[PDB]
């Protein structure tokens, strides 16, 4: 419906700037496999309740599909399909041997007990086994899911398969004790920091002690701020929660800010920092801007007021296309959404490789591989930007669609 057609429109707009056949557009619009199943679980009161689960594999030309699992009561088939379609290009931009996947269950996990959550995960695996697997489809943790549900799902898959193949490789995000990989928690933030550093290098800006402003102080935002201040040595000047933001021109320490937020429930009234609104934080005179909160954070109203030279949107599509055009005409380099949060999927791919090979890498090795892959992806996007004279979002979309088209043409799926 709405999200699926929005993704289709985005794909059309992307193809407007590159040469691919019409049959390729039609093949890419329709996801290859849609699996809608009924997931029954014996509730704690003794009754049996059935939920609706969706597994959407949009494409697998480049390799086994990869996709997160969402447990949200508002989840719909169109949303899962659109997210799988986006995940296709998310894994394509990084140049991974992955296709686009997505999973979801129509359920609210707030009132589900731990036994009920375990039963839900195991029954979902029992229902979707026939269309998943280490070489076929790799589920991942996503919103309202944590590595414990991943452990339960992996255990169920291993039990059903009778331990014939690499069970640990069927899914990602598993705990470090069982098939885990290092750097998973800070994966998205680490990729974002690498992209920020690379954009600064491309623009000729050294980031020694300069201004970075993060709008949104969740796990991803806190990790991004801490990693920036540590590796890049930049001056974190503003962080905001769902309530308000705190600004200090001298700098901030993300550790103490997170401690204060945990203790008081918010970052409001932080010592040495003036309380400011989210819109004021978005319009600060900084060099790097990273929105880590609710999407559509920047619109036409405030796009013209943005002065940060580098905008790394870690959030999923937090900037409207009109605001994208406004930032483009303002001389602002804006890192696309799936070119920023791609660190999570890159480290998930690393975890999958570790699971298959039976060899687990150290923190430094995972960091090095993530750096290489993410820098190469961003540099390819920036080169296409400077070549085709098209937006960063447009360049990343063109690269991803070109890779998918080449994979499909090599497989013989499309003759032209
Ligand atoms: N490709 C992938 O594998 C993939 C895809 C999607 C998501 N993910 C990751 O997996 C996670 C799943 O999403 P999620 O929605 O479960 O995470 P989440 O809700 O974003 O985690 C914390 C969020 O809740 C808000 N928050 C923080 N402290 C709070 C408090 N005391 N009271 C109320 N709200 C508070 C924060 O908003 P403010 O920042 O505004 O304070 C923050 O954005 C995300 O964190 C994301 O990084 C991965």
């Amino acid at each position: 419906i709405d999200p699926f057609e929005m993704a289709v429109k985005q794909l059309e707009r992307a193809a407007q700037y590159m040469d691919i056949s019409e049959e390729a557009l039609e093949w890419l619009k329709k996801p290859m496999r849609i699996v809608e199943v009924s997931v029954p679980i014996e509730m704690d009161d003794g009754s049996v309740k059935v939920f609706t689960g969706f597994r959407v594999q949009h494409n697998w030309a480049r390799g086994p599909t990869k996709g997160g699992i969402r447990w949200h009561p508002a989840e719909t088939l169109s949303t899962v399909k659109a997210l799988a379609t986006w995940m296709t290009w998310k894994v394509a931009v990084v140049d991974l041997p992955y296709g686009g996947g997505k999973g979801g269950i129509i359920v609210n996990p707030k009132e589900l007990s731990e036994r009920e959550q375990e039963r839900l995960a195991r029954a979902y695996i029992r229902a979707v086994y026939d269309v998943i697997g280490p070489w076929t489809d790799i589920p991942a943790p996503d919103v309202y899911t944590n590595p414990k549900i991943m452990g339960w799902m992996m255990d169920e898959y291993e039990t059903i398969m009778r331990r014939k193949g690499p069970a640990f490789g069927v899914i990602t995000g598993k705990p470090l004790s069982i098939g885990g990989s290092l750097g998973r928690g800070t994966a998205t933030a680490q990729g974002a920091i690498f992209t920020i550093r690379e954009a600064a290098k491309a623009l000729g800006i050294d980031l020694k002690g300069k201004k970075i402003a993060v709008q949104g102080y969740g796990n991803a935002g806190y990790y991004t701020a801490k990693l920036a201040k540590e590796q890049l040595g930049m001056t974190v000047v503003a962080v905001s929660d769902s309530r308000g933001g705190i600004y200090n021109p001298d700098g901030l320490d993300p550790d103490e800010v997170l401690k204060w937020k945990r203790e008081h429930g918010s970052v409001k009234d932080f010592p040495g920092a003036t309380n400011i609104t989210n819109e004021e934080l978005l319009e600060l005179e900084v060099d790097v801007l990273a929105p880590a909160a609710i999407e559509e954070v920047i619109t036409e109203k405030n796009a013209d007021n943005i002065k940060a030279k580098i905008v790394a949107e870690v959030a999923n599509g937090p900037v409207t296309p009109e605001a994208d055009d406004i930032l483009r005409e303002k001389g602002i380099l804006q890192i696309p959404d799936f070119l920023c949060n791609a660190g999570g999927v890159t480290v998930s791919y690393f975890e999958w490789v570790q699971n298959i090979n039976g060899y687990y890498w150290t923190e430094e090795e995972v960091r090095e591989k993530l750096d290489k892959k993410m820098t190469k992806a961003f540099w390819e996007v920036y080169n296409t930007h400077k070549d085709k004279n098209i937006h960063m979002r447009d360049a990343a979309y063109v690269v991803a669609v070109s890779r998918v088209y080449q994979a499909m043409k090599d497989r013989g799926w499309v003759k032209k």
Side-chain angles (χ1 to χ4, degrees), residues 89-109 111-207 209-242 244-261 264-267 269-300 302-382:
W89 312 311
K90 187 173 189 283
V91 304
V93 68
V94 181
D95 170 43
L96 306 184
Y98 282 170
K102 211 67 211 186
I105 297 178
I106 303 181
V107 67
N108 182 14
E111 60 274 58
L112 285 196
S113 78
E114 299 309 315
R115 305 273 88 180
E116 296 167 320
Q117 303 214 320
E118 162 170 4
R119 292 193 191 119
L120 191 63
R122 293 187 178 282
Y124 173 78
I125 301 299
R126 289 163 92 90
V128 310
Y129 183 110
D130 271 28
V131 299
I132 66 162
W135 287 22
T136 310
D137 190 15
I138 298 91
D142 223 269
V143 321
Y144 280 177
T145 54
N146 54 69
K148 187 170 56 199
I149 296 90
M150 301 335 307
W152 291 330
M153 290 206 196
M154 181 263 271
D155 188 72
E156 189 65 25
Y157 182 76
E158 182 190 40
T159 286
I160 298 182
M161 172 185 48
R162 310 309 307 168
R163 306 138 56 206
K164 297 290 115 170
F168 294 0
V170 72
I171 63 173
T172 54
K174 298 177 313 293
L176 292 169
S177 70
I178 77 184
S181 181
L182 276 297
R184 184 211 90 249
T186 71
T188 292
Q190 186 60 285
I193 293 310
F194 291 160
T195 49
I196 297 169
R197 143 173 148 263
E198 274 327 331
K201 186 179 291 294
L203 294 174
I205 305 162
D206 190 50
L207 291 175
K210 297 309 225 159
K211 291 171 159 246
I212 190 167
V214 184
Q215 194 303 320
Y217 201 63
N219 182 250
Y222 154 65
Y223 285 165
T224 303
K226 184 192 158 49
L227 263 66
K229 193 205 57 72
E230 275 294 281
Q231 312 191 177
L232 312 181
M234 293 177 71
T235 299
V236 178
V237 303
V239 289
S240 62
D241 55 33
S242 59
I246 43 175
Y247 174 105
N248 189 359
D250 271 294
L252 276 80
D253 186 74
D255 291 331
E256 70 191 54
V257 173
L258 178 87
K259 293 285 231 193
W260 170 288
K261 209 221 185 288
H264 292 171
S266 199
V267 310
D269 305 312
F270 195 76
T274 317
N275 195 337
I276 62 170
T277 63
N278 314 87
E279 292 307 313
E280 180 176 358
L281 188 153
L282 281 186
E283 297 153 26
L284 294 174
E285 190 173 285
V286 295
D287 208 333
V288 179
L289 172 43
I294 297 89
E295 66 275 15
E296 288 102 12
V297 65
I298 297 188
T299 184
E300 293 88 299
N302 49 290
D304 201 32
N305 309 114
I306 310 300
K307 313 171 213 48
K309 283 63 61 183
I310 288 160
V311 174
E313 75 197 80
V314 61
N316 151 66
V319 168
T320 73
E322 293 87 18
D324 274 336
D325 193 338
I326 297 169
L327 264 70
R328 204 211 191 299
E329 61 86 20
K330 236 244 88 199
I332 301 299
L333 183 63
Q334 184 178 2
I335 283 155
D337 68 88
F338 65 98
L339 182 43
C340 192
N341 77 149
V345 72
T346 309
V347 186
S348 75
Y349 158 70
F350 292 160
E351 174 191 353
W352 171 79
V353 172
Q354 286 164 85
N355 299 153
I356 304 176
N357 302 352
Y359 199 65
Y360 296 132
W361 316 334
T362 48
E363 181 87 70
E364 64 270 15
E365 275 155 19
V366 179
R367 190 201 267 216
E368 181 181 2
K369 314 282 181 103
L370 172 55
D371 160 85
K372 304 252 291 173
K373 295 290 287 181
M374 192 76 208
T375 49
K376 201 171 311 302
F378 164 82
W379 268 119
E380 200 111 30
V381 191
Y382 178 92

Side-chain angles (χ1 to χ4, degrees), residues 27 280 408:
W27 191 286
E280 180 176 358
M408 291 175 28

Side-chain angles (χ1 to χ4, degrees), residues 383-398:
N383 290 356
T384 50
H385 164 67
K386 90 178 145 183
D387 186 74
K388 289 208 155 75
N389 200 347
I390 62 170
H391 196 277
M392 280 324 268
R393 174 162 332 239
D394 292 331
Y397 262 96
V398 163

